[PDB]
Design a protein around this ligand. Structure first.
Ligand code: T76
Lengths: 11, 276
């Protein structure tokens, strides 16, 4: 149930 | 400036239960943390799937302390590397991306104690994480202090209460926000007689005796988080242990075990100064 974090960090 | 919380010590405000800790110096069954109550609490987060791995703690602007089992545990084929994780600092809510409040960071290098014993009893369950770039402190982000020999000597005594925090299981549903529980340190003999596992000098156990009435414990998801104590000498918070292992959660006659941070400070110093 985790809210989507910014892709900028996923990169 | 470690251990002095911007929203408490610095304004001369006491949190709702710190008094219980101070009065003793003669998460299951916990409660919601207050905002800014544990500014060093760090969340180990997995990219894919996106998931909470463990708790951890901020010890400086570049270093994070956690349990080695959070990163490497062969029995469960667990063996994470820098690129598999994200460190989230400044959080309160477990699942929400706290925009403008939390900071997310990438890892540059993981360091696992060379003698971590995953085969038997999680002896020396400790690991350090070098972040890529320094985190900036704020009202919700501030490092905890590491104990020196003297502080360890006077505080790590049976009966003295410490505090554990985490977003792990509430029962053996996960919480909405960070939970907190204050637990008393237990006599080695008692820790030894409560399990079949071989206990070493690098661990300590905490929790209430079955007759003590009060209860509480860490649980799955809490691993790697900090067990801290407030020094009545200088008013700072020091991390004395790392949530390590247990056989069940809040089981009567059972206790949670923690990595003895002081006993391993030489390795910690060694790493930090040898690698920045
Ligand atoms: O119910 C819990 C509570 O868990 C707890 C309870 C209290 C505390 Cl402070 C910390 C943990 C979380 N740590 C673990 O679960 C570690 C992860 C690797 C195995 N761990 C253990 O704790 C083992 C230990 C079994 C004996 C040998 C050492 C590992 N027990 C279990 O796997 C049961 C599930 N964990």
């Amino acid at each position: 149930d985790f809210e989507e974090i910014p892709e900028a960090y996923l990169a | 400036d470690c251990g002095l919380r911007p929203l408490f010590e610095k304004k001369s405000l006491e949190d709702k239960t710190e008094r219980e800790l101070l009065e003793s110096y003669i998460i299951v069954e916990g409660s919601d943390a207050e905002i800014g109550m544990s500014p060093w609490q760090v969340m180990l987060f997995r990219k894919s799937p996106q998931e909470l791995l463990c708790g951890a703690s901020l010890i400086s602007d570049r270093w994070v302390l956690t349990a080695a089992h959070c990163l490497l545990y062969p029995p469960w084929d667990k063996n994470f590397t820098e690129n598999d994780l994200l460190v989230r600092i400044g959080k309160h809510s477990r699942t929400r991306y706290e925009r403008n409040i939390e900071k997310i960071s990438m890892l540059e290098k993981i360091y696992i104690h060379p003698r971590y014993n995953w085969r038997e009893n999680l002896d020396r369950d400790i690991a350090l994480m070098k972040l890529k770039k320094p985190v900036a402190f704020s009202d919700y982000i501030h490092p905890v202090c590491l104990p020196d020999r003297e502080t360890a000597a006077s505080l790590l005594q049976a009966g003295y209460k410490g505090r554990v925090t985490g977003w792990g299981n509430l029962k053996e549903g996960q919480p909405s926000v960070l939970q907190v529980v204050n637990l008393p340190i237990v006599e080695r003999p008692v820790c030894k007689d409560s399990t079949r596992i071989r206990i070493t000098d690098n661990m300590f156990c905490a929790g209430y005796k079955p007759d003590e009435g009060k209860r509480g414990d860490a649980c799955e998801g809490d691993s790697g988080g900090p067990f801290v104590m407030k020094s009545p000498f200088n008013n700072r918070w020091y991390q004395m242990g790392i949530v390590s292992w247990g056989e069940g959660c809040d089981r009567d006659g059972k206790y949670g075990f923690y990595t003895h941070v002081f006993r391993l400070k030489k390795w910690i110093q060694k790493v930090i100064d040898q690698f920045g």
